Amino acid sequence: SKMRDRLFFLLSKYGIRPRDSIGQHFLIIEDVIEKAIETANVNENDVILEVGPGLGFLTDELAKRAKKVYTIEIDQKIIEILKKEYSWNNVKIIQGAAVRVEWPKFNKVVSNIPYKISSPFTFKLLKTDFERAVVMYQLEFALRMVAKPGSRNYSRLSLMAQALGNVEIVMKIGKGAFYPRPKVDSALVLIEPRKDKIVLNENLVKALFQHRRKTVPRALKDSIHMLGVSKDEIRGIINNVPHSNKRVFQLYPEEVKDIEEYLKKHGIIS
C-alpha cells in the first residue's frame, strides 16, 4: 500500500502509464524484495546485476547492502526517474536491451526478469561467472527450468539449466505482489552454477531441440539437409549415433555430449 501509492505517485508525477509493454509488471511488495535479497546473501563485498529496475524499488535495497550494483533499463525516461528520485553512490545505471548489451563483472544477480526476455536472458546468464543468482520468472518458465528429462515439458532451456546450473524454486510469488496484476503466478529461482558444468555444442542442441519430439536420428537427419549438407553424405554416419533410441526430450546433458563427441569425431559438427 505504502510501496503502492509510492508506485502510483511516481507514475503520476512523471506521467507514465501502467504498462509500456505488455511484458512488464513491477514488483511492488517489500518483503518479497527483502526475501529475494536474504536468499542472495548480499553483503558489503558483492557486485550485483539487476535487470529492469522499474521504479528503483529493488535497486534501493540492493544499493544499501552491496558495494556495487549494475542495473539495466531500455526506456530512457525510466533512467531519468531513477536518477531524479534517488541519491545513490554505488548504483550504475546502464541503458539498453540487457540481452544485447555487454554485461559487467558481478558475483551475484538479484532481479525481476521481465517475461519478454526470460529465455534469451537465462541462456546468457547460465554461461557466466556468478556464484549466485536470485531471479523472479513466471511459475511456468521456472517449472520449465526444473523439468526432468523424459517429462513432457523438457526443452532446450531445461537441458542447459541442468547441464550448467542447480535450480531451487525457492517459493511461489503471488500475482498480488505486482502491478499491473499478472494473469498468472511467478516464482523465485536460485541459480548456483554447476561445479561440473557439462559444456555442450549450441548448434547441435538447437538442431536436436528444433523438434524435440523426434528420435535423435530423425532429429539429426532432418536438421542437416537444412544446413546445406547432403543427406547421402550423412546417412551412414548418424545411424550408429549413441542413444538413437531416445527422443530428444529424453536426453541428459551426459547423453547430448556423447552425441557431440561422436559427430565431431565422425566429422559433422567438426
Technique behind this structure?
Answer: X-ray
Q: Which of 193, 215, 241 delimits the end of a domain? A: 193
Residue 103 is assigned to a structural domain of this protein: yes
- DSSP per-residue codes, 24-58: --EE--HHHHHHHHHHHT--TT-EEEEE--TTSHH
Cβ neighbours of residue 167 closer than 8 Å, sequence gap 6 or more: 145, 146, 161, 189, 190, 191
Amino acid at 37: I
* 185 and 256 in a common domain: no
Eight-state DSSP code of residue 165: E
* Alpha carbons 133 and 193: distance in angstroms, whole number: 9
- Asked if residues 152 and 160 have their Cβ atoms less than 8 Å apart, the reply is no
* 232 and 187 in a common domain: no
- Asked if residues 116 and 24 have their Cβ atoms less than 8 Å apart, the reply is yes
CA distances from 256 to 29, 88, 95, 136 (A): 42, 46, 37, 29
Residue 241 is assigned to a structural domain of this protein: yes
* 206 and 188 in a common domain: no
- Asked if residues 47 and 105 have their Cβ atoms less than 8 Å apart, the reply is yes
- Asked if residues 264 and 270 have their Cβ atoms less than 8 Å apart, the reply is yes
Q: What's this structure's resolution in Å?
A: 3.3
> How many domains is the chain partitioned into structurally?
2
Cβ neighbours of residue 53 closer than 8 Å, sequence gap 6 or more: 59, 71, 72, 73, 78, 82, 93
* 250 and 176 in a common domain: no
Residue 270 is assigned to a structural domain of this protein: no
Residue 150 is assigned to a structural domain of this protein: yes
* 208 and 167 in a common domain: no
Q: Which of 227, 191, 189 is nearest to 206 (CA)?
A: 227
* Alpha carbons 102 and 95: distance in angstroms, whole number: 11
- Asked if residues 66 and 56 have their Cβ atoms less than 8 Å apart, the reply is no
Residue 143 is assigned to a structural domain of this protein: yes
* 176 and 117 in a common domain: yes
Q: What is the CATH number of the domain that holds 246?
A: 1.10.8.100
φ, ψ dihedrals at 192, nearest 5°: -85, 140
Residue 18 belongs to domain spanning: 2-193
Amino acid at 19: R
* 28 and 158 in a common domain: yes
- DSSP per-residue codes, 167-216: EEEEEEE-GGGEES--SS-EEEEEEEEPTT-----HHHHHHHHHTTTSBH
Q: What is the CATH number of the domain that holds 48?
A: 3.40.50.150
